Amino acid sequence: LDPAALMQIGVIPTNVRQLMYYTEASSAFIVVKLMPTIDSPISGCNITSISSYNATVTKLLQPIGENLETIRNQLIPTRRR
Amino acid sequence: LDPAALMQIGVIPTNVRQLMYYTEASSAFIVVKLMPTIDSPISGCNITSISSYNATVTKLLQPIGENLETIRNQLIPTRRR
Amino acid sequence: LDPAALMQIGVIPTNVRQLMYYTEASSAFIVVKLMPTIDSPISGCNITSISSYNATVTKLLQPIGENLETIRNQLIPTRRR
Amino acid sequence: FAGVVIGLAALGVATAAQVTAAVALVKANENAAAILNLKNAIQKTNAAVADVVQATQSLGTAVQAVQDHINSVVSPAITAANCKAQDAIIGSILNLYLTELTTIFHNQITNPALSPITIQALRILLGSTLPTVVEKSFNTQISAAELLSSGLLTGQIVGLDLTYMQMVIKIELPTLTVQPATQIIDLATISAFINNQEVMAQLPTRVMVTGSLIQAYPASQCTITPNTVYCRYNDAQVLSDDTMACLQGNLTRCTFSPVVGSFLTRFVLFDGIVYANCRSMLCKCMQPAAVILQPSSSPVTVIDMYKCVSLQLDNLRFTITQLANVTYNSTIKLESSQILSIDPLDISQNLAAVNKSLSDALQHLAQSDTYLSAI
Amino acid sequence: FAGVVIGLAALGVATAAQVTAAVALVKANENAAAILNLKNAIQKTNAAVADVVQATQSLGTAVQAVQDHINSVVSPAITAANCKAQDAIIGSILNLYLTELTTIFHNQITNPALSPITIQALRILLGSTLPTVVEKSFNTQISAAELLSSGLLTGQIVGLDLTYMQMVIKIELPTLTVQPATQIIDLATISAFINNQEVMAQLPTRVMVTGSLIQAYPASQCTITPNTVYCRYNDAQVLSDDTMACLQGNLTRCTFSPVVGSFLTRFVLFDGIVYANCRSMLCKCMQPAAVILQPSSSPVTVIDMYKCVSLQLDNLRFTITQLANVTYNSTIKLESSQILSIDPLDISQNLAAVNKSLSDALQHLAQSDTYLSAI
Amino acid sequence: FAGVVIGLAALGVATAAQVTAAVALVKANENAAAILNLKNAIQKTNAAVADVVQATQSLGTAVQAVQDHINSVVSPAITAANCKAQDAIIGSILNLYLTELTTIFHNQITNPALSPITIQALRILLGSTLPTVVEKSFNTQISAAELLSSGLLTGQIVGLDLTYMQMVIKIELPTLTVQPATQIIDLATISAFINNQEVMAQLPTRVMVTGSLIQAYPASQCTITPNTVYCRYNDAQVLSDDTMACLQGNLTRCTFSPVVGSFLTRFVLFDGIVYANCRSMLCKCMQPAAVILQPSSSPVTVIDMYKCVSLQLDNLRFTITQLANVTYNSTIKLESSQILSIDPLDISQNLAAVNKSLSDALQHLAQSDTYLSAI
Ligand SMILES: *[C@@H]1O[C@H](CO)[C@@H](O)[C@H](O)[C@H]1NC(C)=O
Numbered sequence A, B, C: 001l002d003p004a005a006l007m008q009i010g011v012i013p014t015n016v017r018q019l020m021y022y023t024e025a026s027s028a029f030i031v032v033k034l035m036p037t038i039d040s041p042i043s044g045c046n047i048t049s050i051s052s053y054n055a056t057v058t059k060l061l062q063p064i065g066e067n068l069e070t071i072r073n074q075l076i077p078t079r080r081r
Numbered sequence D, E, F: 001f002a003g004v005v006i007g008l009a010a011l012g013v014a015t016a017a018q019v020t021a022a023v024a025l026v027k028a029n030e031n032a033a034a035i036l037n038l039k040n041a042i043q044k045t046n047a048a049v050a051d052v053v054q055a056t057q058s059l060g061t062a063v064q065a066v067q068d069h070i071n072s073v074v075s076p077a078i079t080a081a082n083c084k085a086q087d088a089i090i091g092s093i094l095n096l097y098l099t100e101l102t103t104i105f106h107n108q109i110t111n112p113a114l115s116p117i118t119i120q121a122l123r124i125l126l127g128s129t130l131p132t133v134v135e136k137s138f139n140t141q142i143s144a145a146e147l148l149s150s151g152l153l154t155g156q157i158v159g160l161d162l163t164y165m166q167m168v169i170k171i172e173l174p175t176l177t178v179q180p181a182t183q184i185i186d187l188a189t190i191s192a193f194i195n196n197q198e199v200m201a202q203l204p205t206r207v208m209v210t211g212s213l214i215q216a217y218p219a220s221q222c223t224i225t226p227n228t229v230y231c232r233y234n235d236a237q238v239l240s241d242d243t244m245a246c247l248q249g250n251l252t253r254c255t256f257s258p259v260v261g262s263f264l265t266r267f268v269l270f271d272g273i274v275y276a277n278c279r280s281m282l283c284k285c286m287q288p289a290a291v292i293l294q295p296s297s298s299p300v301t302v303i304d305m306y307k308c309v310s311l312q313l314d315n316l317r318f319t320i321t322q323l324a325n326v327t328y329n330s331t332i333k334l335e336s337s338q339i340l341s342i343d344p345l346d347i348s349q350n351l352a353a354v355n356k357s358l359s360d361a362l363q364h365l366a367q368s369d370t371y372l373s374a375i
Helices: A003-007 A048-074 B003-007 B048-074 C003-009 C048-060 C062-074 D016-027 D029-036 D039-044 D067-071 D083-101 D119-126 D129-137 D144-149 D241-247 D344-366 E016-027 E029-036 E039-044 E067-073 E084-101 E119-126 E129-136 E144-148 E241-247 E344-370 F016-027 F029-036 F039-044 F067-073 F083-101 F119-137 F144-148 F241-247 F344-373
Strands: A011-033 B011-033 C011-033 D013-015 D049-053 D058-063 D154-161 D166-189 D192-194 D197-201 D206-210 D213-216 D228-230 D256-258 D267-270 D273-276 D283-287 D290-292 D301-303 D310-313 D316-319 E013-015 E049-054 E057-063 E154-161 E166-189 E192-194 E197-201 E206-210 E213-216 E228-230 E256-258 E267-270 E273-276 E284-287 E289-291 E301-303 E310-313 E316-319 F013-015 F049-054 F057-063 F154-161 F166-189 F192-194 F197-201 F206-210 F213-216 F228-230 F256-258 F267-270 F273-276 F283-287 F289-292 F301-303 F310-313 F316-319
Touching: A003 A011, A011 E013, A011 F029, A011 F039, A011 F119, A011 F267, A048 D129, A048 D144, A048 F016, A048 F083, A048 F154, B003 B011, B011 D029, B011 D039, B011 D119, B011 D129, B011 D154, B011 D267, B011 F013, B048 D016, B048 D083, B048 D154, B048 E129, B048 E144, C003 C011, C011 D013, C011 E029, C011 E039, C011 E119, C011 E267, C048 C062, C048 E084, C048 F119, C048 F144, C062 E016, C062 E154, D013 D016, D016 D029, D016 D154, D016 E267, D016 E316, D029 D039, D029 D058, D029 D154, D029 D166, D039 D166, D049 D129, D058 D129, D067 D083, D067 F083, D083 D119, D083 E067, D083 E129, D119 D129, D119 D154, D129 D144, D129 F083, D166 D228, D241 E344, D267 F016, D273 D310, D316 F016, D344 E344, D344 F241, D344 F344, E013 E016, E016 E154, E016 F267, E016 F316, E029 E057, E029 E154, E029 E166, E039 E166, E049 E129, E057 E129, E067 E084, E084 E119, E084 F067, E084 F119, E119 E129, E119 E154, E129 E144, E166 E228, E241 F344, E273 E310, E344 F344, F013 F016, F016 F029, F016 F154, F029 F057, F029 F154, F029 F166, F039 F166, F049 F119, F057 F119, F067 F083, F083 F119, F119 F144, F119 F154, F119 F166, F166 F228, F273 F310, F283 F301
Parallel strands: A011 F057, A011 F228, B011 D058, B011 D228, C011 E057, C011 E228
Antiparallel strands: A011 F166, B011 D166, C011 E166, D013 E267, D049 D058, D154 D166, D166 D206, D192 D197, D197 D256, D206 D213, D267 D273, D267 F013, D273 D301, D283 D290, D283 D310, D310 D316, E013 F267, E049 E057, E154 E166, E166 E206, E192 E197, E197 E256, E206 E213, E267 E273, E273 E301, E284 E289, E284 E310, E310 E316, F049 F057, F154 F166, F166 F206, F192 F197, F197 F256, F206 F213, F267 F273, F273 F301, F283 F289, F283 F310, F310 F316
16 A cells, blocks of 8 residues: 555545454353343232233244244254253 | 356355235224323423423424325315215 | 426426525533432442443543543644634 | 325325325325314323224224323322422423434425325334234234334324324235235355356346346335235336346356455355355365365355265364255356456446547557558 | 644544534633533532523533433432332433443544534433423524424534533534525436336436536435525535536436336326326326327326326326426437446446457457558 | 264255354353253342352343333232223333334344344343443453444344243354454545546545555444454455555556535645645645645645645634655656546446447448458
8 A cells, every 4th residue: 555645646544443353252141031020919900011012022032933943953963962 | 047057156045035015905093192191280380391392393293284284175086986 | 407308208306495505603502411410318328320330431431531631732722713 | 096186286296106195195084084073082081092982983093102101200299399390200201202203203395294104203103002002903914023023014194183282193004915926036145266266246136036037126125024025116126138147047148256255255055055165265074084176167166965974164064964956067167258346436447448448449440541541 | 813723733634524623622612611610510400401600691501311310210318228229220220321322422533522413412412301402502593393303403522521421512503594596406207118118317316506507416414494405514426418418408418227117106296287107107088088198209298288187097086287387399309329227237247248349349450450461 | 073063954045154153053052051941030030130040150141121110110019909000101111122122023034043133132132231231241351331332242042932031142242353464544535636627536445455465345344443443254345456556556547536526525634734635725824925826737735834834724724833754756647537437327328438439430440341352
């Protein structure tokens, strides 16, 4: 690259940066609870909200769930167990 | 389309899907209340935030309102049907 | 521009608008308090939230702060401006 | 509709889509009017979601996007004391909603009422009531989850009372039918090695195929499922004769551009077979032990079980337990003239060079009419 | 000299806008200093929006985006009873704001303090306070609803106290003046039927016109209303002589590309009359009853009252009305060489074919020079 | 051959990145299973963030995005009186979260479980818990502020229990190594005045340089800091020989396009030195008092302390105390053939005229073919 010649036609190097790549990754496991805990005692009341959310969320994750199981059932390590 | 030839030069058919179109729709009417209801009794004060919310939302929607009125007033379905 | 000719080949001018340009700017100053005030008296309790929010936000605004000081210090008006 | 409309002039200049929408607007006159006739009752009802009913008949659903929140923060009785705090919290709730409204109702065009209400706009408009609405307002087999997560639902504003601040909206759910003898096909490319260069084929990434007809069919706005593409508007593009020819198996009419290769773009798995560029990538077979070499007259390598049983590609190791069918020959003769760049800057540079060459072939002509007149 | 600035080299490499912003920032020293001088008073006040006064005179506005929400959930006293409960709810409010902050504050550049604060960034930063702030601190005739719902507002950071976590920001509302003798015109296309092909003209979709000058003007960041376009800056683009000539009515200089036609792109309404491709689409006249045929000499049909009084286009039925000043010789002769694709892959295929045609002429030139010079 | 995988046909058709993700998923088997093993304990805990512990050792973190909100607004006992009111707010809390969930989980592709969970998607998924998870789950030099505000974090779903509605996600923070002898350089253009036109050079805006190799390198899906670019992947692009030559200083191989100039694109500041197009813009020096003019052979003007110590550019007034490096190094002679448009419509027009000209050459070639043959 010839920055000096380029500037004579109005081309300006505005930033010069290093390139990074990775070799290893630090990992962490998360459990997403999609259903909140309700601790308060329920007496003579149907909270329709919880079941309607349950149903729709469950349906939404169906494809992901079916895919995990196919893979986990048919993609087998000859070394892992 | 000849997927066999194409794979010989690295062109991979990754998905094959059906094309859908529609001949009719099922509709439903929603009315959006832009102003919430305050059943709480008011004693000796002015909830000033309701009025300014009102004016601003009202000004925001004037062009749509003006446009609906224009169309509803001047676009007239002729007899029969 | 010749709309009469353009429409004969399917080119339709759908809008004709005026062009505005900026000349003078009305100004206004705002202070954003990033930290919220807690007027409730705290006793036998360490609200660890205030602290970690502080620390994280502070770090998020390091570069802005440093750029602000650099510029304030190096960029001096003769008699402004 | 059905029915002859008078006074389209009132629209000024309008697209076919806008005309269509306006006709639907007037068709909805009665429906909107009846709902808005109950504006008083609707406004008196404290509910985030409630049925709008007249004479044992549901006209639709009335929604209030912030009602539950307002209900859980509002004092049971506003007095002179809490008035400062009550107005504070109330004001914040409305203002946040107001801010969201201002992100979908900019007034920019001629007929703003005809603009479609997208699902993104519906989410903002209805807030947390949207799941409840979608679940109840439609008698369909298509799940709420599919309706809430795709672009299938659109709205149109069919009524507005400004005094009561109530907006009637018509939501449509399309009823969809497979187009016969038609497929939408996604094409990916791995790199190939052709005439000493690592390249990729230059082709549309999504096509519509029906009979011998092929068109480019990106479906950017469309709703896509693993098996099905629903488009409201057919957005096909014509392909050239060369692209047609290439896509139909005439590989000498294809176009390839040099690429900077990488691991992740050098192979694909295809139903248990690996298609790989084994020249630009090391294809190390573990059993039998070999390095698979790619003759330069094979642009890519087919690695099925005949070539390898246990394969290593850098850090991936897997068994190939599928056999590929001999739709060959792998030997393909392609010209270097098929290798070129389709970047506008590059095309323009290539055009400049062609123009220059022609410029002086014309000059060599005018000074050949000079030699031809002196003879 | 006004107030000559010293020390611009401290900006490193900067653009004109960054320099301009840098000047403005130091021009704002005293006001920012004056506001931040009151940081302690400001910090102690518990309010979502509060006036910043100095000796009875207001300097600005202190805003706190999560203030009301904190007030509404925080216990009147926090003890070891609460603690876990209070620290839970408080922490989730702060953390949510923090997640929002992290989406608008990411240093990637040399001078982060000079980046504009957009309305999007302003909504995030001010929360529910944004409508209140706009409604108060701008003695203008532009509505809050218009200010909130567009890109007229823009901010610049002019101060920052990290200990107090107070950010001073200068919001500017541009006062706008019409540019005389200038129009911005949006152009749509319907398909035309030319030399046996359904095609569309290829032109910019939005141009600026001043006298005899035309420029592409794709006002993309600009604020658009039905009558006016406001650009903070400029983005005009030069048009070629051919496009200029086309736009000025020399239709033989126009370029058309073949398209996959559809109902919604085959006609428009124009102040009560219809312009339609009546070849690619059935235009059915109901009164007087007749199919409207389109000669090949007419790329599109003008359906005014003289052609049809009552029209049917598929499911659309409406009447046509009189429009003054509508003229057309309607019989244009266009060349098939005007019909081509402007898609980069298609151009490069087209170029490659010309380059090849040329090579065959460069050859013929050589044969014809050895056929000569032998004589 | 530790550790081979069998059954890749299960994936159907899959990319290398997908295959890689599949293999990482089955490696995660044991870890995911051990976590889901505690789904009963995890579920009973009422906490927004909570530790997942197996025999005094931590496996991960359990997060609940809406838990603190829920804890705050529900009464300590649910009666028959409550029901309606409590069903309301709870429902409004869940439906909001549900609406967000539907924005990140659409069923579009073959292997949905292998799609990366982006930071935007993590934000939605974790809500206000995200900053707490980043603050505790990673032990690096990289601050939480940087982790939240960048695309560094990425996740993969490695487990799911639909009954308990629990999704296990593996979050990966890369460990970054500087790649040797490599720079990423950003390029901007100010206008230049060349052969009587205000133009700009047509070049990639971001390039990668290693040794004598130069490639285009938009770091589009990358994490960018003032000194550093991180790319998960590698999106380099091949530059033509002309663009290469031009970037290496053969300026007669550059390409310029006419532009509508403006003040803000006619100059930069480069460490105190002004590079300005002083033909298209008025360059007024205050000391020594002069209008700096730009001769034709100077496409732009370099203004350092030897030219002007105090400059006014319209309303900008500033001093110049620095000096430029004075490599000329030769004559800047640019042809007019370097000035052109790379806009596809324009190229199309150009190509058509070049092809029109070629046809003339071809016919004249067949004509000379005759006069010569007639001898
Ligand atoms: C959700 O619903 C299913 C089926 O009704 C039930 O078995 C399961 O326990 C529920 N899970 C939660 C956490 O609500």
